[PDB]
RNA sequence: CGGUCGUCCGACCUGGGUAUAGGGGCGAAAGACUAAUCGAACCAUCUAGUAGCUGGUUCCCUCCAAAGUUUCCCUCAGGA
RNA sequence: GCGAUGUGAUUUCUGCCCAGUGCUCUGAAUGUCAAAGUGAAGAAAUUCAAUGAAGCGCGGGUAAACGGCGGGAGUAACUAUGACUCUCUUAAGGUAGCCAAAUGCCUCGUCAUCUAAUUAGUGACGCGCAUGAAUGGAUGAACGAGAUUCCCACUGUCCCU
RNA sequence: CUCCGGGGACAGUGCCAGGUGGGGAGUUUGACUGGGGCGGUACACCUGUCAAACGGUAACGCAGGUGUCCUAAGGCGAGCUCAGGGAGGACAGAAACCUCCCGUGGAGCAGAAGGGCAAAAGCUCGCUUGAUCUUGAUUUUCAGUACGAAUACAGACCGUGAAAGCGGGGCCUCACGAUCCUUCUGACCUUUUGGGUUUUAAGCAGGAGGUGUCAGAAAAGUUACCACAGGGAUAACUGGCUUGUGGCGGCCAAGCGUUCAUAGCGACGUCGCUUUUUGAUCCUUCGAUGUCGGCUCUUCCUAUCAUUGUGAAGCAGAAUUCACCAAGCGUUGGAUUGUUCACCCACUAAUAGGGAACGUGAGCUGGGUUUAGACCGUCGUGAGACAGGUUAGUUUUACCCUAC
RNA sequence: CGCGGGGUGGAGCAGCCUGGUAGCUCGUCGGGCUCAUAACCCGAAGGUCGUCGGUUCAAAUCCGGCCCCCGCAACCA
RNA sequence: CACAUGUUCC
RNA sequence: CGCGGGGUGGAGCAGCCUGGUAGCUCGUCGGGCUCAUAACCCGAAGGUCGUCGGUUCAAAUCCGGCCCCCGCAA
């Protein structure tokens, strides 16, 4: 979605290939916006169990 | 400014000067059944969003202080409004100042 | 204003599953008197790739 | 920006 | 169009049939393609849409004859 | 297995920060609340009062989530640099690596080489305006109608037609 | 007696109510401006000046102040004179307190400034709330309309003083706000609808809650994917005016130059030229005059690098400087950079400076600026921005007239 | 703008509640203890209990008025 | 619970 | 030359808007502890707030012209 254009994706656009918004998103978000890490309880590299 | 809690001034019903109990006037609660409020609520009802303008460009930071007079005569009980020039400071009957004492 | 790729997968007609050469639905045997009380013997004819 | 040049067309 | 070029056994090329139709489709992603039309296709209608903005505004003679100044307006290419 | 993401082979790693904005989790311990319903005053409209879910306010987790990761001074026996030390501050004050780079204004930075002569190129130096670790860093065998520097050969590109 | 099981008065549906909701829809993103943006308010007021002796009079003109503050810093009455200076008196001195003299204001009046004020408008006491209620008229900006401010009055009720008198705010020049809506107050007031009573609601009058863009819309950005109507009223380029800046040349001569101001230099002042630099302005052009360089070619200027003819040196010869006539003839090949500019190598008699729409794109090139695709650094939540770098990016037409 | 809850020793909180009670911790000082900074125990000072008025034989406490703060819910001149 | 270290000749 | 900001014991700091009392970390000096240094303990000094002027009853505090330094405008 970063390389996509901003009309067809909420992550597209900008002069640099960056997201510009937190990729973790609530599942209360509507269609067309609920894109990325859906309802992430813990977002990162997993250590341990 | 400082104003006293009593003031002898003209009374409308009596027709002469009588002492009056002095306090500040306060805005009352807006009635839900007023003509403009009922007109506003019927207009605000349904779809269309906000219909009337909402003031946002707050410019001045003071108010015109209004005194609520009170006739001390037991049978008069006349009330009337009195306007004073705008001031940020206001108090009733406080700290009557002297003329040049030793301050610290 | 454009409809994103994630929304376009719900309408189908492009992203539908390719089930032309699939052999069938992989299910278990339906319940009857045999399963409920006793047993029934079945022969493995052949094993095929789906 | 000052311009591009011109791919004119049918007109 | 010519020469010079990349690939040419696999993410290869191609015919026919079929499905996805416009704030929609589809996109190995270029705001690219969608019948020479795409930062929202084409046809008809509302519609003779509005324009403080440009252009134009059709015969003769006689008489009189200017102003670009006050105030106000989200007023400064305009009005009262 | 499906769907939504970020990075982009192999090798080597993936530093610190949850203060901010997000995401996620616990809750009658509850600060708030609309409709509806309950009780009371009133002749009634009406008013008042308690209750009242979610969402927040509160307390944790998360950075291969968005992202960020300092300054002022003195100091070894020639002098300098200066390990070291004092101090102010934040959530951390940039760790391993890399660099005048597609990233550096000053800048045509300094040194060595390439030249007779090089603001070009390569290799080092790093106080880095404003490098830096999956907003991935370093590496780079093979390859690229990708972008630059040099050499042999080759020639009308040119001498000069 | 429900086809078997599994849930079950819970899912789920209908209607309301609250949360969330750029996923989607509509709209907005002020004005002045020596282009625009940025910065400021010159957008509402007041003082001195501009301002040319009635008045009025502009600029993003100069110097400043303001959106207040005062139960007194308001209103009377009474009593004093201030700033400063001199002279004295234990602590006590330059100044702590007392006394005498001079003292037109040089102090103070709430403030910035101007005007004004001495038995006061200043300082200190006494009493009070004229900072109260209600019609009109006039002045100020003016359209001679409002708001605000003020000026003379009238009717009451007062305050103060013995009284004449003064006072309906602040000694004056400034400190503030329309419609609609809301709130409060005033009545033996009007309607609330076929009549009566009572709530309620709507009226009349007087205050308040504000629009500072201040005669008063409810309002965030980006477009390098952009579009339209226009504007040379308005910018980037050439051409015009000016020469601040740059470059160039004289006068005076204090001095350097061993002894000597002018062989050669030359401080401080001063007078000039130039459009090969940059600034300033917007006059021409936005129904388009193709925006940097390099190559090629033609001509012209002298502020003369070389060559020619001449003079002066602190020119023995030689060499090198300076001055005059002088543009006739020449002013190179290369490394780097798109470069203009710049530096270096070598040769040369010298390797001088410039103009012709910063000569020259229907003559050439597209390297760079300056589209649309991308990469990196900084900034922005974001779309995106960067006289910050890198990469690839269509250069059309003469057959018309003139000139040759 | 409304609701809820808070203002207290030099600082923080308790006591407010069902009114007579102003306490504790950190901090200042003194004494004892330690080899000593510290640690440990006691004592002294340290409050109009945010302000004012009313109620009560008695409120910092009950009520109302004023100032400030936090959370949430709002917004036709 | 801290006790770090002090140029050479006999 | 323009706007925003600072200068204070020896190095760094607080205290100003709401002026009535100048505190603290390191450091200097003296003594003690040790044979001596260090560490530690005890005690004392050092702050015209950059300059000038005004203000208020008083100026580090509020205001105006001016010196230095950090980076900014062209
Ligand atoms: Zn009365």
Swiss-Prot record, chain A:
The modification (3S)-3-hydroxyhistidine is found at residue 16. Transmembrane segments: none annotated. Hydroxylated on His-16 by RIOX1. The modification is impaired by hypoxia. It is found in: Cytoplasm. There is a cross-link at residue 34 (Glycyl lysine isopeptide (Lys-Gly) (interchain with G-Cter in SUMO2)). It comes from the Eukaryota. Residues 7-32 are annotated as: Disordered. Component of the large ribosomal subunit. Interacts with CRY1. Component of the large ribosomal subunit. The ribosome is a large ribonucleoprotein complex responsible for the synthesis of proteins in the cell. Belongs to the universal ribosomal protein uL2 family. This is Large ribosomal subunit protein uL2. The gene is RPL8. The chain holds residues 201 to 249 of 257 of the full protein.
């Amino acid at each position: 979605g970063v390389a996509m254009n901003p009309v067809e994706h909420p992550f597209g656009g900008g002069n640099h290939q960056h997201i510009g918004k937190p990729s973790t998103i609530r599942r209360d978000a509507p269609a067309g916006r609920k894109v990325g890490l859906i309802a992430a309880r813990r977002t990162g590299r997993l250590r341990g169990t | 400014v400082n104003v006293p809690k009593t003031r002898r001034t003209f009374c409308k019903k009596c027709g002469k000067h009588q002492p009056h109990k002095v306090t500040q006037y306060k805005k009352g609660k807006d009635s839900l059944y007023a003509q403009g409020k009922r007109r506003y609520d019927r207009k605000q009802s349904g779809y269309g969003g906000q219909t009337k303008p909402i003031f946002r460009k707050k410019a001045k930071t003071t108010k015109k202080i209004v005194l609520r007079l009170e006739c001390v005569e037991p049978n008069c009980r006349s009330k009337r409004m009195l306007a004073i020039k705008r001031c940020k400071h206001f108090e009733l009957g406080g700290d009557k100042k002297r003329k040049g004492q030793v301050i610290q | 204003g454009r409809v994103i790729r994630g929304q376009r997968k719900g309408a189908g007609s492009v992203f539908r599953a390719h089930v032309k050469h699939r052999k069938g639905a992989a299910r278990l045997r339906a319940v009857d008197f045999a399963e409920r009380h006793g047993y029934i013997k079945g022969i493995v004819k052949d094993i095929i790739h789906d | 920006g000052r311009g591009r040049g011109r791919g004119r067309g049918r007109g």
